[PDB]
Nucleic acid binder design. Sequence first.
DNA 1: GTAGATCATGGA
DNA 2: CATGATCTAC
Lengths: 109, 494, 212, 298, 289
Amino acid sequence: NSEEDKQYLIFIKVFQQAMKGNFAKIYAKTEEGKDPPIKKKVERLRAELNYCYDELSFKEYLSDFLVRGGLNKYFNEHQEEIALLIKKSPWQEIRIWSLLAIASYKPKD
Amino acid sequence: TQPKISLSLHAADTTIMHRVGMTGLYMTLKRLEKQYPLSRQRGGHISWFLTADTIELFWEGSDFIALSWLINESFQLDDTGLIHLVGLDNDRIDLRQKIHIHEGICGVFLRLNKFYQAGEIINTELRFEEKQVEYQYKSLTWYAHQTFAEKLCEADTQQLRHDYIQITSWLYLGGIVRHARTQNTTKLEEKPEYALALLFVPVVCHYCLLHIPSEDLKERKPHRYLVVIPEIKDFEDASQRRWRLQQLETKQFHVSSLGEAGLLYYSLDDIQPEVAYYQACQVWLYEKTNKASRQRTLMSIEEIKIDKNILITYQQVQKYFKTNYQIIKYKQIFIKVNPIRSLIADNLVKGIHWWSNFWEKLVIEDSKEYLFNQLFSNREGFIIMAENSEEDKQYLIFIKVFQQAMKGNFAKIYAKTEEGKDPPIKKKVERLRAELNYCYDELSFKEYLSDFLVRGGLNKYFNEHQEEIALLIKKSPWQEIRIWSLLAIASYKP
Amino acid sequence: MIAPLILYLDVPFTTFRESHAREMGKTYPVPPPATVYGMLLSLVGETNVYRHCGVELAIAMLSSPKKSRILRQMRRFKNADFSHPENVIPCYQEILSNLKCLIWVRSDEEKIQPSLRERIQLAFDHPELVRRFGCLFLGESDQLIKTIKLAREDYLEGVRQWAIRDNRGRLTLPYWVDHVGSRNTRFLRYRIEEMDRLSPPDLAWTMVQSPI
Amino acid sequence: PNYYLYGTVLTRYGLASLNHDIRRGNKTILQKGYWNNGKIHSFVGSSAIRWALRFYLQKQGYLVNRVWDEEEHINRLTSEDFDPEKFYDDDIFGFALLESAETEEDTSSTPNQRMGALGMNMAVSLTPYDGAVKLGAKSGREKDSTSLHFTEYHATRYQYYFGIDATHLKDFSRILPMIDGIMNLPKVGGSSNIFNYPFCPDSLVFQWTNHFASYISYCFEYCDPKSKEAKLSQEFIDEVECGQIDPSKLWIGGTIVKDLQQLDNFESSPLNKAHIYRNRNEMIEALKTVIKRDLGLE
Amino acid sequence: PNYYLYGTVLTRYGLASLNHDIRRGNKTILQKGYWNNGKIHSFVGSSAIRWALRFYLQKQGYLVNRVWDEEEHINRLTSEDFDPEKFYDDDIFGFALLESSTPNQRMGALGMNMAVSLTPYDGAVKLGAKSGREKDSTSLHFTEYHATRYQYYFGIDATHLKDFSRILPMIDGIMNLPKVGGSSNIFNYPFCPDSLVFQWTNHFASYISYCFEYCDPKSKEAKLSQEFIDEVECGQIDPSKLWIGGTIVKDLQQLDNFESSPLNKAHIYRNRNEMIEALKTVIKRDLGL
DNA sequence: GTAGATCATGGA
DNA sequence: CATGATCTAC
């Protein structure tokens, strides 16, 4: 695997961990009822990602979501690489990678 | 004694056409020997000694009499006026395939009225599925193959010529006189034995009809002729192959690619695991240059080399994909070919992926979903081809991911729409195909595909193959991903 | 015996039409011995074709060229009037792209001195003393030669596709060509065997002789 | 002493549908074939460029035997007996007579034929061809057939290689008009109504030498499809450094001069001692001065 | 002599949808393809500009063989036999009678190339929907538009014209181009020139084809390309045969060392009418009109 | 008497 | 259009 591929996979894992954290926060906040929705959360995330229209808004949303995720150990291990990848890459490609991470997400059993 | 005519496959001066001609002569001699067991019955006491790769002819008396007897018995005309080649088992072949062969010979070899005298247009109405369709073919009264014996022998001494014989395009395909003002000199010249071989050429070679998919089959009947000229390895092998090809139905000879005809010539061949299978052939395309063209013209020659894997894959494709449909309208049998197979056969011949040109040949060049509808009929063939793929299972994993996403996307609206309001799979699949066709570059297509995957909900196949599918989407060209999405739509099981 | 001469050839486009391919421009996969002999005669500026009968040539394909078809409004002598539309016919011509090959020249069987090998060596030694006309080409006059040079047995030191004289071979390449008809054209059957061999095998040598 | 002028010329970037192939339905297929690395590039036949040069010579005096009738769109012959000593066309491009095909020798005595002193390889696109088509619906509510056609185009640069044996010319002074025509090429046969593609050169590598071989046939390539930078090929530079292709015999001009000069170590490279001019006119003037000095045209 | 008028003309900035191709399902796709440095640009066919020039010639009152009925949206031929000597359109654009004395075809003096968007196509789309709650299959739809400037290259063989005086109406039509076939109802894009680079020379070579470039990938800047400027500096392009007019004149005049560059001694006019008048005077003098 | 040019000759 | 029978001129 090339270094670009490695950074892309690390970004996918970072986004997946951020979604894990956000969904855990929703679970804790919405413990009431039979079960907090999971498909609705994914639809919300997809709609909010598709809402972004330019680089600034999308990157603001991405940083906000990543921080809301929590510790994000894969971002712990890769400050410079992932930070440079987010800052440099076109926002459309980052959105594509984020949606791929959304699609390839496994909820915790 | 001394053979008056000796022909061998090992001769260094022979070309492919010469060897095909010796094979045709071998088949004709076998059939004649079965018909005339005793040499005294045959005119001029002509006798032959046939081996695996050699033909020797012995006869007594004048050479002209023996050659005339052999040639007249070889090329015949029945009562209906069809070309009757005794090299082929004419009892076993039916009337329709005989008409097909006669029309192919008349359109490829006897392109010119200078080499055949035409009779009346015989019309026959053979019943098929309680419908009598009137075949109309041009009956013949004579063709140059019958009376080439005069050209083979001297006029005065009535003996075999000791010099080269000037031949024409009806003997050797493509042997055209480029400059008509030099007709006496600039003419291809061959030895008399090779002239006889070129005479017997048409027996072995087989004829296929090429269907252009841009034009509708109903709106114009096919006219392009494909000539499959095999590369001879042995007289017995090629003879058995031709006599086995005699089994094929006439509807199988209509193809939409040269590679399909090349593979169809070898489709019936038995594959031996212990023997290294290798065969080669040439497909010659004859097509009218313009609408008012009087005769067909040689446009392209394609050389096809097939190995064991190619033959096995083509046999599986033939077994599993839909066969040629026989649409029967008024006094016309419109044979609707399968574009899928053709494509797959051409891709196999070219040595590229079997899905190499599926998109721009299936969706872009489709008028009213005529080609698109056949995908769901060939779904089983698609599934078999994907399962038995020689390599690249990662893209099959991608097929599974895309099929799961399609299931989710369709199920969303199908739950939204109640009974009666539920639309069929056709409309949603058409909308999905249109949206896929919308994409013009890598960024737009990947964005749409990723959004579709997300809207498909949880994807277990993507989850189990995160890294592999992610790398495949990121790295692979978007056109290949679009083609594979199309064929995953085709093989989608509701 | 003097080591055979080796020439490295690189032609971007070639057309070795088949002897019997007159309705369509079908091409041979490998340059025929007759075409190579004519090219060498042009290189040494020898107009007489019978001068260097007996030279032996061996061709090694450095790579397999790709076959492509191009449309062409080729002319012909069909009508007496030059401006008649019948004189122009559209027909396909098959070309080979990026042809690289090594040619072995052996001139042991020549009876006329200096031999073709010596003439080629002298022409490459002193290019200013070569008296010839036109531009060097392989095939059609418009298909100029990119690189022709003296090389060794290991110029690419790779694997070589030799042309072996096999009586069961596919290709029927002519070593003598009759440009009027086909009476004097002489043929030989070849095969392309993949052999890194730097040197040519015994069956890879073809002697150019008169049809007589 | 033979004198040959070899040259590789690169054309400007633009949309081209020049040569075309046999039509297929509504599609007018650009003719194409395989090239370097097995990719498919769009071609322009050599006969097309030879026709363009013929028409250039006809358009500016220069008495020619093969006159192209613009009104009737037919080719006419002023003299049935070709005379290379009088006509520029026969002298440069050669000719073939009826008796040339029914005999083995070149004489039958008036000459039976003449190999043209000029030979040019076919032009190929510097960038691999990607399927690009155009719609062709004709205006009007009456939508019959012969409407909605598709034309294949190619937005790249074309490069071709030519060579002239200046000694073979009957009149040595005829090489100068041919050079002028190569630089001032009017139009290579194509859909100039829809895709006007000027074939005037924008980068040259010429070679005026007495050697029968020139290893400079196709020196321009950048590949990386959908681009127009068109750098000099690495193998051409390597062959220049090796020792063959004498730099003093090379003539480089056009926009490639800027890229050559911007290269590091170029001041000490063997390519530096070649005649390099940014202005194509200046390089052509110097080359023609050298040619006239060598051929005795003064 | 043999005089040619080569020219690259740049259009104004605006929203454009003039080049719809075969639509894919619901959305109307505008014609596009690859261009400079690998990005997709939107192309306007040259047949559109030729039709616009024909319509200009018809509207101005010149004798034109192919008359276009605006109310009927059909094309009618005044004479079934094309006569380039009498009709402007046959003389200029040529003809080709392909059906089973007078010539059947003409090469045409005017040669035009496809119009290319100066800015790469971003992917903008616009939703359209019929008003009303009664909605059917044809209710909502999408149309692709592009906010850019279009540049195109044309060439005229003045000597090829049957009547030499017909070149002036063609220039007037180029500078006064009517609507170029598109979607004028919702995307009214004026195709009148706003930056010209013309060349009136007797030499056949032209180095001005597509000489405009963008300063930013998504911007309305339209600066002159560096290659064209360099070719002017080196002396390849004769400044006395160069005609530059439009808004690019200001940017050229603000260039450093402009007064010392050979580009200075070229015919440069901020007003396009003055440049056209001077060029037409030169053309009339050269052609002896 | 023989070679070059010309003309006929082909559908469902 | 390709090719041979025929017309025709030397």
